[PDB]
Amino acid sequence: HHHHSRKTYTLTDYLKNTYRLKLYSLRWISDHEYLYKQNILVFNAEYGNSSVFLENSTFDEFGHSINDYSISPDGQFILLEYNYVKQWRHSYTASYDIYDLNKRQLITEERIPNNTQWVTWSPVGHKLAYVWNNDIYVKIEPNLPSYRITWTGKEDIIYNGITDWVYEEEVFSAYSALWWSPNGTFLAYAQFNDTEVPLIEYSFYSDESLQYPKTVRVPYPKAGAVNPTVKFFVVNTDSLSSVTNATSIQITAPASMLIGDHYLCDVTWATQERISLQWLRRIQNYSVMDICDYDESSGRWNCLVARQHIEMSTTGWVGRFRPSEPHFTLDGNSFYKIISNEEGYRHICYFQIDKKDCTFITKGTWEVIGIEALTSDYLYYISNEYKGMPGGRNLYKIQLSDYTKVTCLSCELNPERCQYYSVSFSKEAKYYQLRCSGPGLPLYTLHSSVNDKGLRVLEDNSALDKMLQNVQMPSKKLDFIILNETKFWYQMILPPHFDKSKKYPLLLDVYAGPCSQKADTVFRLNWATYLASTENIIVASFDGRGSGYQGDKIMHAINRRLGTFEVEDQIEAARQFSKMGFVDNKRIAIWGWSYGGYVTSMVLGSGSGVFKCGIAVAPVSRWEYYDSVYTERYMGLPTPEDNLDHYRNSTVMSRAENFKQVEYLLIHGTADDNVHFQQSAQISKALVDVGVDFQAMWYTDEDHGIASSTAHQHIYTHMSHFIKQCFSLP
Amino acid sequence: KTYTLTDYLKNTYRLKLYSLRWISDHEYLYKQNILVFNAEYGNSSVFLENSTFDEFGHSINDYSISPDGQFILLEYNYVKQWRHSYTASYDIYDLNKRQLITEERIPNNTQWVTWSPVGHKLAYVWNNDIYVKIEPNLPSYRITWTGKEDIIYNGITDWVYEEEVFSAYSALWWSPNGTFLAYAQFNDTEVPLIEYSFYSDESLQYPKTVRVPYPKAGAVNPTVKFFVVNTDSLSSVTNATSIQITAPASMLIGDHYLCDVTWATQERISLQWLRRIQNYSVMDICDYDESSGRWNCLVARQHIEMSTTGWVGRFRPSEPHFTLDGNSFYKIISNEEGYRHICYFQIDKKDCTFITKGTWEVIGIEALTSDYLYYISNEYKGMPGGRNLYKIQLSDYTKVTCLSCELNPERCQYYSVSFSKEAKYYQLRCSGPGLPLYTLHSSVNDKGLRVLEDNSALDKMLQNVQMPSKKLDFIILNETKFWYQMILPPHFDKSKKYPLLLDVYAGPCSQKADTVFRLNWATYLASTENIIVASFDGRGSGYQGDKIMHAINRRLGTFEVEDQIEAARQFSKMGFVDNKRIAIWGWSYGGYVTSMVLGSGSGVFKCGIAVAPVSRWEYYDSVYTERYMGLPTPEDNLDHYRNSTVMSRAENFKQVEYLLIHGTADDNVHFQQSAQISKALVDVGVDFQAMWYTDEDHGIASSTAHQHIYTHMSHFIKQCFSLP
């Protein structure tokens, strides 16, 4: 054997986590210290020295299994979370206890109730806010009785300080709708009203011992349905009394929003007494930022009309998925935020509190991904400028007083193994951890930002590097192709000892939704790794029209027309890959999950002749079935006067006849609250009505993730069988 | 050329019938056009033309003529609900005046309609209430006012009575001359509801949630009340008074079912009741009282049918056939040795004398006259799968004549019958083993009148096709005969090895081995794919005595499962079977057994298909399930409910390839049952195949769905058997 690499990355390796990626997950507490787990240690960023903060043996004497913990800003208390029951993507329920660190014992008086929906410390000190039964409660001291803020909370109808289904999944990517002011004086919150929002009902089968299935009911607005309404409040937590009910000052939306349906899309405190709100019209091409000041003598809030900021688009929607968040200066009279410039690229605009015109501090044919830190002299941000590779990510430092003075902080640190960065800054940005994902093994490092120099390697994944040495791994090839003189990027997971003169089977792995990017420099140990390493399949992905991080010309091209250009662009990509000479074009497949599944289906249903088989997992089948926020963002309204015509023309069903030429596998979890089972039940019924044979698989009580341990392994195995079969692999 | 899948799916080769409805004692109607036929001469005059209702505007689903021949009821806007229940719109056509009635019409969405046995009285059910029309044009009298959707059912059955007790939707029973209307009332107030999604048309944005009161095993059952109203005295001024007939004391002590309703005379009615523990039933004889207007059922006229080894009746206690004076009746009961035979009863006497004997069974009493009782049984040649018509001389029980045995003994061994109003004539229908044969006979001398349908059309076409053949036979297990049948590929060679598919029902009182001629999926598999399709009636199967039928009492998922495995083993030792390629497939109970077999880890089968299978007995209804299992409680039979689940055998599915199929709108076997099978396979990491059918019910019966499922299964099987 002469020590040559003979083992490959098998499906068992993938499903059983044989080759694990180490992460260095930390959480800052001061400007120079952070916490890390092994045990819980406080690490000193300056010297590297660490002392055990909390011994792993301290909560042995407890009684319950602890899911997570949260130390208070002042480090005097720790919140212990147990009895975790998942709800949707972000939401959950849990019991909480509070351990006093200075007394070294559990608070037994005035306990946080069972079935708490959300709990949060103030940014400083140890105030506590939580939601239980859809109502907000505040504890000024962990061991004292809590003041009740709201009294209107009602299951599925009124949500105080937590989000409803749609706001959670599509707007805030969070269950939480509470925001403390910087020093914990104020507590801003949203209230959602789902009174007339229609219910999605579906069976939940539960344990085998449940005799009668459960019907799950969720207020869920499908495209065009009645949306939930939103109200916003601020309460002063320092003027609470155990005798009068707490007074919550309502901040109303600007007049231009109240005119019709709207959303609250962003909350950001500017200072201790100034808060910024962003609102969005249901037709999501117009948004208004309000800046509101606390009035001393009256105790209310005022958003002066002269400080309003309008962001809008003529070619699409506003923001990548919502309007970008402002980053304020210490005085709160200025802010920085990412918006698209004249040539349609997203860049950092510098705004003054009460002037309409902002000046662009970054320029170019690339985009700023996010503003990560702001100090007195520098602003830190992540972008894909380096070598003009949209699929890359680096940290940049821009001088506030000289816009020509831009330094790349990460570009050249490790040019070959590191081209995809994310960052974690200390409380005042004195230190930061850098996180590199690819194209090589993930690497974690710590830095001093004063001189920009590495202090030490946090995690280098050498234990994994050891194991990979003997393994025939795949390679990635990230490159591009010209189409209508526009550059379009693709990535290919290529099998070991790749021969360009040989013909390989090809799997097109697609997402292709608005602002997607499936062509990047990230290192992954996934299903594709196996298919390449073990089965000698090339797994490609392509970013056609509608994909993000390369300007609005590309991203907005699909505006109001989902299921058109991006679908055709995937098809075209496959024609292109064939023309590279190393693809067996009688063995070309396509798969995808969510939007990816929709595109897969539209492609297999298009009678193009290019694809032999495909897998759709939890796909949308028709847009009137999916939620309003996401769908209307790109499709407008499903009404005759708006966009009904394209809603009606862009379904999977009406292409059922075409599936007679392809082998189709269709997978869906019965308890999918996101993309409802309904959607696959309509595809299956259409394929039956035209007499088309297909393969199928439902996952009892699985949701959109099909993410449970056993279900995950079973679907990937099932898909691997289907693919090997379609490609004639033994 | 062979019989193909397309052949079966698109019905290229059609079995012709001869469906008739006796109108009098020498006349019957026959669809074409609708003709009246004389049983004597065979001449026919048209009753109504093909398109007499050309200007009707509605699509006519079914016609129904009144007994006095004066009015025809027309049915349209037919909307199927469950197996037997449906909704419809109606119109009444005056045959004399040649025009539709337009005043006081029958409402839209009527649940049930029926003429009285004589004349033209007409009762219907609408919004769970009973109405009566004396005359087609006159207003209707409202009988009941308590009808409430999903809660109270007057004159119609709820889900469990429709499916498992009466095999019908109607709970209405006219007396023989129409004076009385007897009806049942069902109360579903505390019966839990099965809920499931209905997705409907693509244009429905939010799925429908269907909810049906449906008692699963050991749950709260509907309650029942029995009433009788006098239709001859109906005031349009005062509310109609309904006389309740309460169940006997021996039944009121606990949960019970009304299982049979039979009029004896113009003033005497019999009711059979069954304890929820279905091994005890009581028959009441109730007499109308004149100078009081009530109904009386003496404790001395009660008859008790019970069983120590099992449940009572095949599926329900048998129905009684009364003499004209109604002082005597005949009904099928199991004898001392466990075989079902006819007992003769006296209304007054506790004892009954058996009039038939032997190691075979009476299938049913067909007609009772002054001097003869006619019945069907499987006695001919000791074949439990045969059916012949028998005449028994009432003055002397030893004089028994087989009326169908020798008519055409090669092609005909399975007969059903249809006697005219007074049994003057009868139509014999022969279902196999050759092509079906329909003949008319005179009962005064048993002589044949004529052949009605001989299927010589089909016979011609079938001459051009390489058809399979059928072998019916038995094997001996523990000194007992167990019957099996086999569909054999054409030009069958004993010295060749064939893939074999076991077709399984195997539920209690099932019979899958018989002489019937069938054109079905199995026919295609034997014709085109060269697969033997075998069936086998092991323990728990019917028409062979209690000893075999009651064997699985309280033990579903055991002996009947073990016996399907042994059958396959016996089939292996027959020499012409490739034991590397044996499969099993089954629908309903058929699916439950198929899954149990595949999960047994016997090593016998490579693969199997389970369509809409029961997965565990607590998921299934009370009536059927508790008939065999008792109650799922710790003091009764909880342990065996917990032992007989498909889920518990999930580990063994690693040895087989499994295809698991279910309609999502199945009201009978809830998708629940298959959802739990798959969860279990998932939890132990077994790869299997699945297919759901959106909005299909237990039948998966829609044109396209039907063609889809059979096509999908053919692929699975061809793949399992390495067939191109």
Ligand SMILES: *[C@@H]1O[C@H](CO)[C@@H](O[C@@H]2O[C@H](CO)[C@@H](O)[C@H](O)[C@H]2NC(C)=O)[C@H](O)[C@H]1NC(C)=O
């Ligand atoms: C949530 O919103 C609903 C309607 O979206 C509110 O219900 C309305 O209340 C108004 C004013 O009292 C009444 O005119 C109607 O009875 C309701 N409208 C309709 C047509 O449903 C409800 O008050 C709101 N709940 C809260 C506490 O904010």
Ligand SMILES: *[C@@H]1O[C@H](CO)[C@@H](O[C@@H]2O[C@H](CO)[C@@H](O)[C@H](O)[C@H]2NC(C)=O)[C@H](O)[C@H]1NC(C)=O
């Ligand atoms: C704080 O507000 C709550 C909720 O409105 C008050 O509780 C209700 O008071 C109203 C009338 O004032 C009564 O009709 C209800 O019976 C009360 N409902 C309950 C118990 O939630 C509460 O009293 C207020 N607290 C004070 C004293 O200011």
Ligand SMILES: *[C@@H]1O[C@H](CO)[C@@H](O[C@@H]2O[C@H](CO)[C@@H](O)[C@H](O)[C@H]2NC(C)=O)[C@H](O)[C@H]1NC(C)=O
């Ligand atoms: C159907 O059965 C239900 C359930 O037993 C009966 O409802 C009861 O009626 C009595 C008298 O009206 C009440 O005191 C009880 O509260 C009821 N029980 C429940 C839980 O509903 C009802 O009488 C029956 N209805 C008919 C028309 O027969």
Ligand SMILES: *[C@@H]1O[C@H](CO)[C@@H](O[C@@H]2O[C@H](CO)[C@@H](O)[C@H](O)[C@H]2NC(C)=O)[C@H](O)[C@H]1NC(C)=O
């Ligand atoms: C026949 O009986 C029914 C039900 O008992 C009567 O209908 C109800 O009559 C009572 C008063 O007798 C009212 O309080 C109810 O509201 C009625 N129910 C409805 C809406 O149908 C009916 O009136 C009686 N009819 C005759 C002919 O006496």
Ligand SMILES: N#Cc1ccccc1Cn1c(N2CCC[C@@H](N)C2)ncc(Br)c1=O
């Ligand atoms: N989730 C989801 C989802 C479902 C149906 C259609 C489109 C989407 C958008 N989406 C998202 N999200 C994008 C918007 C924010 C969240 N809803 C998650 N993540 C991954 C894929 Br693949 C995808 O298609």
Ligand SMILES: N#Cc1ccccc1Cn1c(N2CCC[C@@H](N)C2)ncc(Br)c1=O
């Ligand atoms: N139907 C049904 C059904 C469902 C689950 C278990 C057992 C049955 C009984 N059954 C019936 N019925 C038997 C009893 C009367 C009706 N319920 C229909 N017909 C055909 C097959 Br195969 C079968 O398994």
Ligand SMILES: *[C@@H]1O[C@H](CO)[C@@H](O)[C@H](O)[C@H]1NC(C)=O
């Ligand atoms: C690190 O070392 C210093 C030495 O002065 C010590 O005092 C300190 O406690 C250590 N830091 C932490 C946070 O453990």
Ligand SMILES: *[C@@H]1O[C@H](CO)[C@@H](O)[C@H](O)[C@H]1NC(C)=O
């Ligand atoms: C939470 O639930 C547990 C167990 O049901 C109970 O013992 C505990 O006291 C509860 N916590 C409180 C007091 O809210």
Ligand SMILES: *[C@@H]1O[C@H](CO)[C@@H](O)[C@H](O)[C@H]1NC(C)=O
């Ligand atoms: C936080 O800010 C508020 C409002 O400006 C101020 O009144 C309060 O004193 C501050 N908190 C502390 C303790 O500094």
Ligand SMILES: *[C@@H]1O[C@H](CO)[C@@H](O)[C@H](O)[C@H]1NC(C)=O
């Ligand atoms: C927003 O969208 C609608 C419909 O696409 C369009 O008519 C309108 O002009 C847009 N508004 C703005 C401010 O561009």
Ligand SMILES: *[C@@H]1O[C@H](CO)[C@@H](O)[C@H](O)[C@H]1NC(C)=O
């Ligand atoms: C049949 O013909 C006879 C006379 O030959 C006649 O009396 C009878 O009415 C006819 N019946 C029918 C229904 O055609």
Ligand SMILES: *[C@@H]1O[C@H](CO)[C@@H](O)[C@H](O)[C@H]1NC(C)=O
């Ligand atoms: C049945 O319904 C239709 C349309 O809804 C109506 O026109 C017709 O008259 C109805 N028939 C009766 C008898 O009510």
Ligand SMILES: *[C@@H]1O[C@H](CO)[C@@H](O)[C@H](O)[C@H]1NC(C)=O
């Ligand atoms: C039917 O029987 C009843 C009750 O015995 C009797 O009064 C009546 O005469 C009969 N009806 C007719 C019209 O034959």
Ligand SMILES: *[C@@H]1O[C@H](CO)[C@@H](O)[C@H](O)[C@H]1NC(C)=O
């Ligand atoms: C009927 O019910 C059960 C059957 O398990 C049994 O205990 C009881 O003895 C039976 N009754 C009779 C007398 O058959």
